[PDB]
């Protein structure tokens, strides 16, 4: 019950509210003045219970009607203020809003923080309740926001300000209202909220954050959000606005990492240095330094990688003297991938022709591509060795050499463009293998280029009726992955015409799946323009109509997180009815690629995939491991590996094959000794089937990629920056792997080399302002945010001290433990430039 | 093989602030859960073979199915099986049974009427052991532990790093530590660290009290310990946490005490499981005890327990970290200076800091305040801290 | 009366603990004097409701699980749960108002209003 | 002081409302329905079908299984206690059905009276209890699992510093077996039992593992948890059947690991004590030595607390030789360091004599822990070679960090 002070205050409140019965002149001003005074005193204090509000439980009906009849001036406004404060505690949402709306304006700050928050919530509720039928109510709510937002800004309440500004769908005022000490908080809030908000508000929020960062001149972050938006005009605007040459070099490094090559005018000083950095010619050299820091110059051999000295030699000296072709292809992939990018191998460099001569047709192409893939990012160094094998006796393997070129020029660009020159006279080659090699090399060398000359040169291949189905598919995929995430009308129209003119009998083959691929590869991350795409694709008949629609639906929403598209895809998967299950497989890959945008969505996609596996039909069971591989590329999560190990022994050969490839992709480059042991056990168990052995050895090569210093992650910048080229590469490999026997185990091993398009390295090489390497002590650990929305860089814990260059595993980041240097980019990934601290004093 | 049964956990939703970002992440979780529900509801609804297989096998075996103990395998289809009443019967082994699974002492499903071997029971796990397995991972994570960097690093190198990165251990040649005892004054973070590692680990986790592994009947104690460790072996990557090992880890000594000798037999079986004849495999053991000096040397010796992680009373930096973590969900005022609580030598532990925060919240609620102040914390310090009586000598020492 | 008589002549049903469900159609139970039995489940009884250690009832003919029944409690532990509440009152406690409020801050406030 | 006022319902409503409620209600409801949804998924899947011995369909494919079920009949196992032999024409047979009862039955016409000898176990029909089939003699399952049948990979070169202990062990468990002629010529009966005792971690179980590794005879690793049975006298019967199985094998080896478990001291002032465990220990004592000579059964026993053993068991007629494992000397500790650092990726300049001298009173297990900790230190800072400083830090972390409280100011007392 009450107290003496409480009872006296209750009596005073009751007297003040009861005096309003009649219309005496000295009632409305005195009583409302007293109520205003008490309410303001209680509300403008600590969060203590508002004692006047607790005591006040009257009815305002008489108060509302008298409001209607008495004092059209300020007294009704005082009454409105009082009833608004009273109804903030009660449930009078619309009335409580309109009391502040039409009553005494004064200011929302004069009431209290809680009153401001409640008014903000009610304003958001009304705005969501108000449609475009009338804009009369919108303007006063906007005026309320005009004062609500600065209140939150000045009282560290940026949460409510940002939320309200997202409800009203208007975010322009953040440009003119954000302070120096609060830009990071709101910017991080937006860059985290963009992933979960659906279309089209995510793009508006992204451009709002872009404008904020431009206003505060945080140019690297502006570049990050510009690549998030995937629009070149604002990237060019940021490039022009960058007046600091060190920031220019940093943004060139990040552009090269993302693979975005924008033409630079000669008006910008130091054009040559920026161009050569963006071409990423230096990377290999740094990689070499990397390797000579870890004493891993010496390349490995497949015999030691398989560890034959440990396998139980049940048949000794009688069952291993025969060298089958398929195991030779697997050993080529191993003695490639494992030793790749180190500039040397002990079996393909000194005994090349002898090795290649024990391969047949497809083995020739695979080994020729692996010869270039054993030396990465050295265009001249790679081609100096590739030319002789291009001059080979078996001119059919010439195409393979082109792959080598295309696999050597990957991740780099030259002014003279050796790849374009070398393949310009070979693209029009009538031989199917020659044209295939030419187009594949051109695509791999020019991933993400979007250069009009190469696209125009690739156009006539689609209209060539002579060109075979697999030539058409490889051409379509190369065109798509040269024009990743651009919605190029030229390529879209060309592929649409090619598929429209294609016959059903010729469409029934597996390679026709690669026709939507490039089309889909033209529309990565842009789901707005795909209504016309689906309308155009609706002309073709089912089932391939549904197949193409599903594939373009995946490609449109790559990482979008649109749960409605995932619901449609899950409905497709759950429909229990050969080619009919292709739709379900593509939809499963769609759930994977949409959910990999967000960590939460991905981890729930894990549970959905488990449910699909334990309760799905054979086609879904085959499809899921590819999805699991897509979800966690180069992220050896133990639960995923355990599920894949459980299903590697399944009685369905396709399911086991897909599970093995999922081991290879998920644990790629992590050098996981547990994964290596499990793969050795799988090789021992599957020692009889050539296909299982081939794919398990491929998985071992993938997991020993670069001796553990290479990753296939399509994500960068704390996994927030997507990579269109890498996403394209994994998409091609996975959709080809939807049919392992006909494509992977058939005539199309070269498709595996598309993963090298996604081949991106991990280091911590630190450069000075002049780009010389600089050893800096670095604190490396997990980025587990021990705070909420404090704006912290996840507050790296699990500390370990390192000297650069350093190797960072997936999910573990780094920070500068020394204040002597300041990084231009606060995200310590890849090559960075540290400016000497001017604030530090000796 | 029977790979690990890792506990399931929902993704962490951060920030923990009551903002729209938390709403969006939680609603994404709800979306995906509803997707799973819709798929799992429409799966069996659209299900239109093996039914003949079931109608034959189940009819042949019939219900109920008795559970007996295999004793001898006479022929390829005849076996001497002892029923639970201890009576042996020469019964037949039906065709639909894997002859390689039958081993002496195995649990075998028999027909109710003719007791013929109709199948083999695989698990036959003691209910007191299957309850030790953790199904719901605890919510406490490594981000909820203030300070304790050395202790967390040691426990990660022991039970976490070998699972994720066995490459270092295999390359250098070390066998990773397979036994850790978390010892120190109470309320320092031993059980909290066990909760955190259980949350983080991808391997199966078994939680023991060090006293539930003790049974009434004469031989069921060591047998229960053996069953628990065998279950840990089954799910190969395993972590066996035995809180309050003091209950059984006490030092061996000679007395009549007919129950104490069984106590010592149980602890002897435990140390045999830890390191005795035959290898232990890839199962780690985490032990916690307030008093370590009272433990038997043969239990905490290296090889059985490789690491002894000390949990001291938190220092100034650690105490400040505890206060920052445990008031993160609070709404602190501007007049609060936590430093005064962190300084002085009250010898307050992490649990003491948690109680201080809780009592400060209660003090604020007493004044009808949802935001705490410095005075509330000061009152809570004296209100809660009154634990020890004297603990100190007089003014002898200058 | 006739229905009571007819229900009476029905054989008494065994009561057995539950180790775990096995099939969504069979349950591993443990009767008092004999050992374990893998038994069928009644049509009305749902498998997702028979949890381990739940003390089901099995028919005397085929040991069919027909009732879920209340959970087992060690007879000695059940005697520790008070049924007839005592007669003491807060108004019968003198001089401990501060103590009463302090204890009720833990025994009443959290359970009644955990939202605070 | 001012008494705390009660919290009225209006106050509760205000505190739970006058604050964050824009998203608090929605967040809480979403969390609650998330928990309910998780429960729904778990319930709706909720099977995890238990594995049962269902063979692959092609394995059985037998519609004659029902024919075997109905045609063949179950037989209860019972040992023929006695032959009555009334007139050698209606002989009668007294059988004992385990614990059921004992009966006077006759054989079925299928079997011959000469094929059913006294004392063996036979199958009897469940109705007329007539003998139907002779059975092989009972072999306890757990007793046959007590055997090792899988030699561990611990050789004798992995036990450093125990040269005398190894030689005395091989003198009792290896030499009298491989080359018995070296003893009978001198008329010496070699000891038939060895008690391995010493500080924990000194290498008793390691030496037992080496013995089992190169035994070449029947090795039985007795489990101390199985001699301890629920029912009265079952542990004694366990010992009897174990010794009988050992006698069946030619010159078997038995290793009672951790003998303190069932080798306590007999007593009666405790008003009952163990009794059953004491009875099992007494039967083991009887089997070891006494009437009914044990035979060629060399017995291995290990315990790192020997002072609690029964003097009757400790008497040198059951455990004749008492090999003691002591803390290794400097040379032995150097040998242990070299053994345990053999596979490590360490430097070639490590002075292992220094490290051995830095651990004065340390068992071999502590040396292994020191090596592992040196590797851990070399891993923490990611060096691929473990240097001398890493080993010194490991020695400080393992030995000195937990040895005593003799701090450096207190350690200044010695120079
Ligand atoms: N270092 C710490 N960081 C954060 N919270 C801590 C810390 N130490 C203790 N706590 C808090 O104290 C609570 C109780 O401590 P905990 O359960 O870890 O006890 P303990 O050290 O295992 O003690 P005991 O000897 O009773 O087993 C934890 O739930 C946690 O919230
Ligand atoms: N001389 C030695 N050489 C090498 N390693 C040794 C030596 N002595 C002991 N060890 C190590 O000690 C470890 C554990 O010792 P062990 O198992 O023999 O203990 P124990 O003394 O029998 O103790 P308990 O009292 O538990 O029976 C072994 O794994 C082995 O690596
Ligand atoms: Mg605890
Ligand atoms: Mg031992």
GROMACS .gro file of C-alpha atoms in nm, chain A residues 215-328:
model
  114
  215UNK     CA    1   3.062   1.258  -4.595
  216UNK     CA    2   3.304   1.143  -4.323
  217UNK     CA    3   3.569   1.058  -4.586
  218UNK     CA    4   3.621   0.695  -4.480
  219UNK     CA    5   3.711   0.598  -4.835
  220UNK     CA    6   3.803   0.227  -4.791
  221UNK     CA    7   3.469   0.165  -4.619
  222UNK     CA    8   3.300   0.356  -4.900
  223UNK     CA    9   3.466   0.117  -5.145
  224UNK     CA   10   3.344  -0.182  -4.942
  225UNK     CA   11   2.984  -0.060  -4.949
  226UNK     CA   12   3.018   0.030  -5.318
  227UNK     CA   13   3.119  -0.326  -5.404
  228UNK     CA   14   2.834  -0.441  -5.180
  229UNK     CA   15   2.598  -0.237  -5.399
  230UNK     CA   16   2.782  -0.365  -5.710
  231UNK     CA   17   2.759  -0.043  -5.912
  232UNK     CA   18   3.059   0.100  -6.097
  233UNK     CA   19   2.958   0.468  -6.109
  234UNK     CA   20   2.990   0.526  -5.735
  235UNK     CA   21   3.314   0.326  -5.734
  236UNK     CA   22   3.450   0.569  -5.994
  237UNK     CA   23   3.320   0.861  -5.787
  238UNK     CA   24   3.505   0.731  -5.480
  239UNK     CA   25   3.819   0.676  -5.688
  240UNK     CA   26   3.809   1.037  -5.808
  241UNK     CA   27   3.734   1.165  -5.457
  242UNK     CA   28   4.038   0.982  -5.312
  243UNK     CA   29   4.295   1.260  -5.267
  244UNK     CA   30   4.528   1.052  -5.045
  245UNK     CA   31   4.766   0.840  -5.252
  246UNK     CA   32   4.814   0.590  -4.967
  247UNK     CA   33   4.437   0.536  -4.955
  248UNK     CA   34   4.449   0.510  -5.335
  249UNK     CA   35   4.702   0.227  -5.308
  250UNK     CA   36   4.495   0.059  -5.036
  251UNK     CA   37   4.179   0.075  -5.246
  252UNK     CA   38   4.376  -0.058  -5.543
  253UNK     CA   39   4.479  -0.355  -5.327
  254UNK     CA   40   4.117  -0.420  -5.228
  255UNK     CA   41   3.997  -0.379  -5.588
  256UNK     CA   42   4.254  -0.636  -5.699
  257UNK     CA   43   4.143  -0.866  -5.418
  258UNK     CA   44   3.780  -0.836  -5.531
  259UNK     CA   45   3.893  -0.862  -5.893
  260UNK     CA   46   3.725  -0.536  -6.000
  261UNK     CA   47   3.926  -0.377  -6.282
  262UNK     CA   48   3.801  -0.025  -6.358
  263UNK     CA   49   3.965   0.183  -6.629
  264UNK     CA   50   4.174   0.466  -6.484
  265UNK     CA   51   4.215   0.794  -6.670
  266UNK     CA   52   4.559   0.950  -6.711
  267UNK     CA   53   4.442   1.260  -6.521
  268UNK     CA   54   4.508   1.078  -6.191
  269UNK     CA   55   4.870   1.089  -6.079
  270UNK     CA   56   5.059   0.764  -6.013
  271UNK     CA   57   4.833   0.590  -6.264
  272UNK     CA   58   5.093   0.326  -6.351
  273UNK     CA   59   5.147   0.215  -5.990
  274UNK     CA   60   4.773   0.187  -5.924
  275UNK     CA   61   4.721  -0.004  -6.249
  276UNK     CA   62   5.001  -0.252  -6.178
  277UNK     CA   63   4.878  -0.303  -5.821
  278UNK     CA   64   4.521  -0.359  -5.942
  279UNK     CA   65   4.651  -0.610  -6.197
  280UNK     CA   66   4.787  -0.793  -5.889
  281UNK     CA   67   5.119  -0.876  -6.058
  282UNK     CA   68   5.307  -0.850  -5.726
  283UNK     CA   69   5.097  -1.112  -5.544
  284UNK     CA   70   5.292  -1.417  -5.661
  285UNK     CA   71   5.619  -1.258  -5.550
  286UNK     CA   72   5.471  -1.191  -5.207
  287UNK     CA   73   5.339  -1.548  -5.205
  288UNK     CA   74   5.693  -1.667  -5.274
  289UNK     CA   75   5.813  -1.462  -4.978
  290UNK     CA   76   5.523  -1.611  -4.783
  291UNK     CA   77   5.644  -1.961  -4.863
  292UNK     CA   78   6.007  -1.883  -4.787
  293UNK     CA   79   5.891  -1.750  -4.450
  294UNK     CA   80   5.733  -2.089  -4.370
  295UNK     CA   81   6.013  -2.302  -4.523
  296UNK     CA   82   5.757  -2.467  -4.751
  297UNK     CA   83   5.942  -2.406  -5.077
  298UNK     CA   84   5.984  -2.779  -5.133
  299UNK     CA   85   5.682  -2.916  -5.323
  300UNK     CA   86   5.517  -3.244  -5.229
  301UNK     CA   87   5.454  -3.571  -5.413
  302UNK     CA   88   5.120  -3.760  -5.421
  303UNK     CA   89   5.286  -4.071  -5.275
  304UNK     CA   90   5.368  -3.896  -4.947
  305UNK     CA   91   5.037  -3.706  -4.949
  306UNK     CA   92   4.847  -4.036  -4.967
  307UNK     CA   93   5.090  -4.179  -4.708
  308UNK     CA   94   5.116  -4.521  -4.869
  309UNK     CA   95   5.365  -4.620  -4.598
  310UNK     CA   96   5.073  -4.628  -4.351
  311UNK     CA   97   4.805  -4.799  -4.561
  312UNK     CA   98   4.778  -5.172  -4.492
  313UNK     CA   99   4.943  -5.333  -4.796
  314UNK     CA  100   4.714  -5.635  -4.802
  315UNK     CA  101   4.839  -5.714  -5.155
  316UNK     CA  102   5.213  -5.655  -5.171
  317UNK     CA  103   5.410  -5.633  -5.494
  318UNK     CA  104   5.132  -5.778  -5.712
  319UNK     CA  105   4.834  -5.538  -5.713
  320UNK     CA  106   4.998  -5.194  -5.746
  321UNK     CA  107   5.222  -5.237  -6.053
  322UNK     CA  108   4.939  -5.138  -6.292
  323UNK     CA  109   4.883  -4.765  -6.347
  324UNK     CA  110   4.523  -4.700  -6.445
  325UNK     CA  111   4.437  -4.375  -6.622
  326UNK     CA  112   4.190  -4.244  -6.362
  327UNK     CA  113   4.431  -4.276  -6.069
  328UNK     CA  114   4.687  -4.096  -6.286
   0.00000   0.00000   0.00000
